[PDB]
Amino acid sequence: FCLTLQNPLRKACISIVEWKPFETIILLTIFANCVALAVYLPMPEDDNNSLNLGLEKLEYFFLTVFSIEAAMKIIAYGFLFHQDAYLRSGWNVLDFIIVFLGVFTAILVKALRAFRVLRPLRLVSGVPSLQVVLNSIFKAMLPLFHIALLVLFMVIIYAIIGLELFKGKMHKTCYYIGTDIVATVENEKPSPCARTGSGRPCTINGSECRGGWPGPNHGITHFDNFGFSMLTVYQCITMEGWTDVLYWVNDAIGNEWPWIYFVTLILLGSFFILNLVLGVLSGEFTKEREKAKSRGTFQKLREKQQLEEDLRGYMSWITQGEVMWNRVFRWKCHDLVKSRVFYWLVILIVALNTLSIASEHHNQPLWLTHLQDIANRVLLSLFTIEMLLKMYGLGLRQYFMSIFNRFDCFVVCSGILELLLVESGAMTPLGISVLRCIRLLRLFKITKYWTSLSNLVASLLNSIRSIASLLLLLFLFIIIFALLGMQLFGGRYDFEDTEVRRSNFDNFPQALISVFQVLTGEDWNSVMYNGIMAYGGPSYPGVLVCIYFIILFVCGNYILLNVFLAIAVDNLAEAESVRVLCHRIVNATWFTNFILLFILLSSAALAAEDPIRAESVRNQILGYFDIAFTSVFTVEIVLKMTTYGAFLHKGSFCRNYFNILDLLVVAVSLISMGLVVKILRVLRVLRPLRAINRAKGLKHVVQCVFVAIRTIGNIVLVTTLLQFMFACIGVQLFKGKFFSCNDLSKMTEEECRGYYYVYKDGDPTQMELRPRQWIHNDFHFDNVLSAMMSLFTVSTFEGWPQLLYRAIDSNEEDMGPVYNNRVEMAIFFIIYIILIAFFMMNIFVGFVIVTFQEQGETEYKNCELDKNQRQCVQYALKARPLRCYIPKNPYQYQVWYVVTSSYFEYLMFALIMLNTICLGMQHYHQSEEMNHISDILNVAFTIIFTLEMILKLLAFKARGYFGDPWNVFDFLIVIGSIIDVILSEIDTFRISSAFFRLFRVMRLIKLLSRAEGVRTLLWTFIKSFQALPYVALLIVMLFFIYAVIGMQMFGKIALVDGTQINRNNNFQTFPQAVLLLFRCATGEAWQEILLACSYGKLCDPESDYAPGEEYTCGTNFAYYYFISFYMLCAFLIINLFVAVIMDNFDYLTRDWSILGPHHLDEFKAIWAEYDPEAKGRIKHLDVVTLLRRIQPPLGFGKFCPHRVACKRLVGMNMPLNSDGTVTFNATLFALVRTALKIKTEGNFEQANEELRAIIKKIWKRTSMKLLDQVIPPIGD
Amino acid sequence: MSPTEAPKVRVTLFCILVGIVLAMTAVVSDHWAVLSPHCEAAHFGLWRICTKRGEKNCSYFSISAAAISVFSLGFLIMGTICALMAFRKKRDYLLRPASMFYVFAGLCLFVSLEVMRQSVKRMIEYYYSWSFACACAAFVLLFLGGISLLLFSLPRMPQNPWESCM
Ligand SMILES: CCCCCCCCCCCCCCCCCC(=O)OC[C@H](COP(=O)([O-])OCC[N+](C)(C)C)OC(=O)CCCCCCCCCCCCCCCCC
Ligand SMILES: *[C@@H]1O[C@H](CO)[C@@H](O)[C@H](O)[C@H]1NC(C)=O
């Protein structure tokens, strides 16, 4: 499409347009835009500083230079130079800003302000190698499409169900007496009420629940109006803030029903992102199995690195012969150095150093800080000598060549430099802290150990150079969204309020913290609720700023899910290279089935004790039900020991059987005194663990995981060293800070005392008078032990913002926070967070690569062609024809002639879609004319769908209609709709109909019925539900033990609202303690619950405690408890990750391009066309027309018919039975051998009998020679 | 054959026929909730609200849950006709709607629960009674029993792929 094709002097421009460094001049001017948009400080209501005012004029420089460039790109070629799509955006960026100059003259508006953010995408198109990355990143998106489309159906189901169950339910308030103020307590979120039963009595003493609006977050967390429902089941799916949307419903309706809505949204939202991560790791691994056949090239490689091993070694043999009285000192420096002594003389020094550097208190009374300086002075005197003995008696050139001892050079020099610089005295107090942090590098001295250290660094540093392309795309992704958010939000966080909206965007670093906060998932809920409330809070135009925090969280994770593959394809390349009476009882059915029924009754009472009454009727029943149960138990340990004796304790199940029984017996000795107590009660919980060793599925799963730990152990031992190394740099840098005074105006110790004013809401006419004291921020960095606590929670991506934003605000030793002092200390929490994210991901890749080895260990017994070549034999050898239930009676036959057609197929699919939008609208405060229409609609859509099951049942003749389960599922929906119509209109002559409405929603699940590519993915998981649910048995057991251990212990805990153990989040009953643990299992702010259990909480005035002891029911076992729950939840959820690799392995190693069984599964459906009587034997005439209509991956050409496919079928040994009626199995085997490549005779008969040997070797049925007669049909 | 012959349907159909008798018991019985004002004590019923002090004076005034319970017995009638036709022609498929009808027999009993739990809040001291506890166990019998008979009627996911859903 070229433009006039001329040759003036303009042809000489083409020699200058495309010279060499024209890329470099444009690279250096787009990088100026990145800085020009970074120093753009936004201002709230039309304000401009000076530098902001000069940078407005600097755009006109970058307007014309990008126009001087681009017009020369037109003169260079013309309209065909829109060929690069990445240049097609080039003129697109410029053509908006020329329009911006036009609208600039209209002033002598902020929509084009946001398009200048797009310019660094030009920086991608300039620099190559990132053309490799963006091309590679869209190629992962093809196999993920069915997973992402089911999550899109996962949200729409739970948006409509949450819309019809909860419309309008939140709008109740707890206002004061008659006022407009919503009544809270001091941290309590403004949560709804109900005047009627089951939700919130509203006991805040001078307040009455009235209609209007208390609402969730500010208006944004409703359930009315399809768009809000779909927004607040989105946030719930990301497991972030799903407990406020639970505890708001649970506060308005009432509990005990709406838990089943959210804990099935989490358990399905988890399960279908857990198989999205395994989705991407399918498509690129099958490419990499095709390069594993270069096994003879690693044989050449390990020879060469053996040649590099000798050649350096022999040359040191040469080196230490050349430089050779003073030799008498030499042999001394062999016999002292290489001896057993310096394997043990150095450790006493090093382990004595890492206790010196990790002592580090706040106060250190006076003698400790004197020992810190002498030790450092002493232990350097051992460091230099140890080094100096290597200087003489090892060889000078050999010493510096080793990298680990080059590291020891940098240590010993820096120790001397930092000691003498203090004696010089001329050093700033900023610098002596820096010298102190330099010593901390001595901790790597410990790493002269780890035997695979040199294997480990070669694993990690090889991975980074597979990520350094992608990781530079991630950093240039988080810049575009930081430059965008600064234009949309840009100091619109004004709000006229007093609460700290602290992650604002009104700066470049504050928008770079705040984007990286919503990237890692932590607390993006509070962030999105400010961008929505900055513009127009909730409205039409305004809630479309949700779209900024969606694409940032979906795309910003999909980049980061693609660094998970490039490691996994790099980490996979390295992997290529009378006692007879007691004897019966133990083996009786009477006794084993006794125990399993007795365990279940033992722990049903042990589940729900009181557990806090100690006097009531639910105690005297259970004390009789407990002591009588210890009798039977102990009785069982008698009858096991009378069969074997003292040597039966070999089994790990009997060592626990004898442990739980002896403690339950001593509770009877402890109940023998009261007439020690409760400890022995809880030792009875171990029981069902014994029943777990009676399960067999786990032997495969748990054993496969401890294979993977052996190879990942090396990484885990390093990632827990960094939490010690960044503890000691974290202590060093934040000692005594985080020590904040209650009113933020007093700043030091003595004067944060007395009483002050707390001004409510916003105005200084509502003064309340509270006292003030030091608050110590609960996760402080004081001790190295007490800093591994805090740095463990920022490791789990939970609660870092609050802590991170505190580490910014800190100043000198015992002083309160200054507001935005030193943002430079946000680099600590970033580099470490990013690092731990990189070692947590290398572990995860380990558990994947190990299991794909361990599943293929079963298929190393191969002697066969391929996996696809394995299944398609088992698809031919095993399959059988299809139903084809064709009717008689031409009255009825005309009816069937409609039903199976595409008339009903396309019509009943259509009326669901109108039934979707009929449920789609359904907003709140709708009109009464609209209430009349949708009540008709519901009546209309039932009569149509019941007319479906009338026509089909008069067609399919009952036999066949119940056959498919989808028709039986329709019969469940239809009757639930008819009983929903009737129950509504009988009322018109009624709250309970809210369940029957759900049946109206389930019609959307008829959609996926025709969606063939999706149903085939759910059915894979139901077929996979084999090795999973025994792993789920350990999850249930885990939640069961930690419920009962905490329930006796963390009860008496005084459900005061505002204090994070409240009426929604009890520890008291058993199902309230299961849900609390499901909160800590999805990481939902578990760090507070830990602080809620303590030593000084109140004790719930229903218990005893009768004098005084009113603030002593907390039990600090919680640090031992929530932490020990959190690792045992993390480790065991990894076994859910492993168990999904286990049975889905045939689906995750597919190749749906070569021999996809979708061609095979559709192939049965052509047989019903020509063989309709289920005879299972076709005529050999109409196979010929059946060949031509399949698909060219499995059928034949459109060059039809041929002597080619007909040459193929005569070329196959196709048998002809009586009259020439073939079976499908002989025809299927020939038409799969058309793709499964073949030869002439000789090789054909050799393939036949070897298939007979391979199938019979597979066949554990040594009988049934009809399969061998099937090889006479398929082969002969 | 193969659905009906396994004892899985034996135990499950028997359990249901217990809860059917419990359901027929819980409808005609009269002790749902104790009116206790403190006399003019009474018991709510689906058909009669009888006043007791020993003087027993029965009459009636909760209109909705009465007509719902008619529908709950209507499926229990239809759910047993389909089951008795099932065993006699080697026809397995009639257990498929017969398991469906028991579930809607269960849910319509559950509505009759939560209407009667609602009418207490309209109105003096209240507590529940024994036939309300009979109706709770009649629910759990039927609703779990109908679903379990539904699952036992359907055959096994093809597990291996060459015998899908027939
Ligand atoms: C291809 C890569 C992505 C391209 C990057 C740019 C994407 C498009 C950006 C749209 C420009 C928005 C203009 C910002 C200013 C809004 C106008 C205004 O001031 O009205 C204020 C008013 C009041 O807000 P106010 O109170 O804060 O301002 C008051 C100050 N005065 C009086 C001077 C205006 O708000 C409104 O009622 C109208 C809002 C305009 C519509 C809101 C939509 C903007 C967000 C859409 C989401 C885009 C997501 C981008 C990322 C997704 C990737 C595709
Ligand atoms: C508020 O509660 C306290 C104790 O709970 C009570 O003494 C006081 O009278 C209450 N206030 C009012 C206005 O009743």
Ligand SMILES: [Ca+2]
């Ligand atoms: Ca998270």
Ligand SMILES: [Ca+2]
């Ligand atoms: Ca979180």
